[PDB]
Design a protein around this ligand. Structure first.
Ligand SMILES: *[C@@H](O)c1cccc2[nH]ccc12
Ligand SMILES: *[C@@H](O)c1cccc2[nH]ccc12
Lengths: 306, 306
């Protein structure tokens, strides 16, 4: 028992992190096979950081302008190209630590692990969710550009996020590993901002089920509600609508706890309308929305990876 | 910016995890050089699990009774011995992935990373603190015995915890890597229970400083307090006393924020006496006590490891 924000073991990703330097900009790159992936903003100078034409900036570069270091061993760049907002550097050495991997793009509401890095050296690992507004509430300092987010399934690493920048509210924006931004953000200097967010309803319900599995029951009740009536309440409190597919996805947790999904919706309705009245759920005084139904099932049931 | 529960990168520990089977009990072991460390309870059967004499149980064992598997490769046990509550199995192969390491014992109030494992395969990583009552609020299912907790300093892994058992409130107890239990717990079947806990005051103050660094200031005030007057309030709310050494340890964070330590104590006094009145600090509606001053400085300033 217990319930923690749990990241995937990071070893398979640690062996891919390298340092990329170009001019006076140093950031992180991801070394898979004989390609290093990094944010294209590495080719930018401070004056360039206003409205850059990256195609012009890149044609002016030579392979030898890119200094790539894997630990204390230098990698020879032998080609370079741009894909959307990422750069692809061919090096003369395939990474012998390349795991089996995929490049996947995730949905708002999904979670992933982040390996924060600086100067190509991993610093820490933590769990994040992609917000409905396509930002993530990360923990990043300068030099963390190019740190990646990922999930692991058996032995295969699905990379889903590369970090690019911090927005004015302190939240973070980046791309998938094809270089396409999550949300309406750009890698140039603008007044861009997060814009309005919502709470991930199906994840809150999953977490209430985690709580019942772990012995917190004070918020349960005899009442039930209809899906339409719950969704009218979700809308008032800025929760996102609950669909029949969400209900279906919650079936296994409902069957394990014996609590009908619509019954747990009635409990959530009461919690939004009454607050918590000084009590806690799984050590939190707030309704937590950064655990998916899958996250709850891995942690309360117990699957590993190799 | 941002502030997350952040674990150390787990790769160096993943390469040490193995599976140990004896009879019908399977759990995790830690393989360093040519020794595998695991809980001595592995030699116990269900009837033995009432008041076992482990010295008798162990003399009845042969090396060949211990099946040790590193991935899908079997390790030959060539010796065995008991140290306090851990078992030490000599194998015929030194682990080529052995990091530089130390066995350290930590203090209540300190934090560490936990690599949860099952069948010798790492499952997830998360951050924990050692509670004042010598338990930890972990996330563990059956088969997680022998999972370890650790910190990393530059390239050196300081192992501080091996997991043994779950107590009736759902919290967890284990040993240091010398096999000495944290707190008044034993590896036999009793009615043992956690017993009363307190809140780690210096860690709460560190986290308030993290919040100010990250832009949360609503809880600040002009007031100050004396150390004795704060400690009278800490005692009412079951917080642990604040010492002059705690004040000294908070000096760097105080100097960075310009907020005197005793001023931040006056803020904490107000928060205990008034609650939070519907607001949050670093995304929490509770006063968080599982970040040390060191944790705040690594994350709000930014050190890595190799
Ligand atoms: C580094 O990830 C990056 C990418 C885009 C824009 C930007 N500005 C400062 C760093 C940075
Ligand atoms: C496995 O860590 C362990 C250690 C002591 C007592 C005990 N009971 C069930 C598992 C276990």
């Amino acid at each position: 028992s217990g319930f923690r924000k749990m990241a995937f073991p990071s070893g398979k990703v640690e062996g891919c992190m390298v340092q990329v330097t170009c001019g006076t900009t140093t950031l992180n790159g991801l070394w898979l096979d004989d390609v290093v992936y990094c944010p294209r903003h590495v080719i930018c100078t401070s004056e360039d950081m206003l409205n850059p034409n990256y195609e012009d900036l890149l044609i002016r570069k030579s392979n030898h302008n890119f200094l790539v270091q894997a630990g204390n061993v230098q990698l020879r760049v032998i080609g370079h190209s741009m894909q959307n907002c990422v750069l692809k550097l061919k090096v003369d050495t395939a990474n012998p630590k390349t795991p089996k991997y995929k490049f996947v793009r995730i949905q708002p509401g999904q979670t992933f692990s982040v390996l924060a890095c600086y100067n190509g050296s991993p610093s820490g690992v933590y769990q994040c969710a992609m917000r409905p507004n396509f930002t993530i509430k990360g923990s990043f300092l300068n030099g963390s550009c190019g740190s990646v987010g990922f999930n692991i399934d058996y032995d295969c690493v699905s990379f889903c996020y590369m970090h690019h920048m911090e927005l004015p509210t302190g939240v973070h924006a980046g791309t998938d590993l094809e270089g396409n931004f999550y949300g309406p953000f750009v890698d140039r200097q603008t007044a861009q901002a997060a814009g309005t967010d919502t709470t991930i309803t199906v994840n809150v319900l999953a977490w209430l089920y985690a709580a019942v599995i772990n012995g917190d029951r004070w918020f349960l009740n005899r009442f039930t509600t209809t899906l339409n009536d719950f969704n009218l309440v979700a809308m008032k409190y800025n929760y996102e609508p609950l669909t029949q597919d969400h209900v279906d996805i919650l079936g296994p947790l409902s069957a394990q706890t014996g609590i009908a999904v619509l019954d747990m919706c009635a409990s959530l309705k009461e919690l939004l309308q009454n607050g918590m009245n000084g009590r806690t759920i799984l050590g939190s005084a707030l309704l937590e929305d950064e655990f998916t139904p899958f996250d709850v099932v891995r942690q309360c049931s117990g699957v590993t990876f190799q």
